[PDB]
Design a protein around this ligand. Structure first.
Ligand SMILES: Cc1cc(O)c(=O)c(O)cc1C(=O)O
Ligand SMILES: [Mn+2]
Ligand SMILES: [Mn+2]
Length: 178
């Protein structure tokens, strides 16, 4: 049911990118169905965020070779510190990487996990929940209210579609994909 749900509510490119990523690391998306849904969800949010501005460089969704090529290449032309971990976007207006978090838990909680994981980076953090809460570094939310409203609407809709299908309770308790 969860596998059908994802093949039906995300566009084939997101599904294929997610499915490929899982199968390369030896994860079956027919088994790790919550993870599958989360990877698709987070991918879609990153694509939506980029699309609301050539203000953003999409790093998430690329193979590792291309992602590091995009990163090293931004760093050499801007001078900005090289992150330890692949972030999700680069913002050419504010001249900072963005790490995008999508969480079934509280936003402050997942914010802290992110901020701790990348403690020594100057990467901007933007957390979304499936409840329409966000939290971002210095309460700087990067996007305009409308672009953020679209993302929150899309995430709430995924939640409710999952609930229509009696999948939400599994998904929200499953913390995998975070
Ligand atoms: C959990 C995780 C979450 C992310 O938001 C992310 O952007 C990412 O690139 C990777 C992972 C991850 O599986 O390490
Ligand atoms: Mn990422
Ligand atoms: Mn992310």
């Amino acid at each position: 049911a969860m596998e059908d749900f994802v093949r039906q509510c995300f566009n084939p490119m997101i599904v294929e990118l997610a499915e490929k990523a899982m199968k390369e690391y030896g994860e079956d998306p027919k088994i790790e169905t919550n993870k599958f849904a989360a990877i698709c969800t987070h991918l879609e949010v990153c694509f939506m965020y980029s699309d609301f501005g050539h203000r953003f460089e999409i790093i998430e969704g690329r193979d590792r070779i291309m992602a590091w090529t995009v990163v090293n290449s931004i760093c050499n032309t801007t001078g900005v510190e090289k992150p330890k971990f692949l972030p999700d976007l680069y913002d050419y207006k504010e001249n900072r990487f963005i790490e995008i978090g999508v969480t079934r838990r509280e936003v402050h909680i997942y914010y802290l996990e992110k901020a701790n994981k990348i403690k020594s980076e100057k990467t901007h953090i933007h957390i979304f929940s499936f409840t329409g809460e966000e939290m971002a570094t210095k309460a700087d939310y990067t996007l305009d209210e409308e672009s953020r409203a679209r993302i929150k609407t899309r995430l709430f809709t995924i939640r409710q579609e999952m609930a229509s299908r009696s999948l939400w309770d599994s998904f929200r308790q499953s913390e995998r994909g975070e």
